[PDB]
Structure 1
């Protein structure tokens, strides 16, 4: 269900986005961003350093993480 994407990057950060099914999607907060504790409690599976760095308004069910090099 939890669909991941490849890594694409510029010279300074490395990014990733993740798509979620409906049930997890309907929980994402519309007000504040998240923290690693928070999205691990959601059910993401990835490393240390990934930061949830914005929300795309038209489609809330897509998360965007980035981390430095």
Structure 2
């Protein structure tokens, strides 16, 4: 599974969020920002450059990615 959100931008960043299934979500630590190797390990296929920059606590199964523009 794994829902990949549409990309969205602001002035100096490009974004996207990924929603994880219950299985994969049990592998993501509590209040932890991940490195490419760590989220790629979860199955998240994404280009290089994306940064897990934030965690919305009420929905810890949504991975929020950021990447500087252009």
**Structure 2-normalised TM-score?**
0.93
Q: CA deviation at 1:23?
A: 0.3
Q: CA deviation at 1:26?
A: 1.1
**Structure 1-normalised TM-score?**
0.95
Q: How many residues align?
A: 69
SS at match of 2:6: coil
Unaligned runs of at least 5 residues, structure 2: none
Q: CA deviation at 1:27?
A: 1.2
Unaligned runs of at least 5 residues, structure 1: none
Q: Which runs of 4+ in 1 moved over 6 A?
A: none
Q: RMSD across aligned C-alpha pairs, in angstroms?
A: 0.8
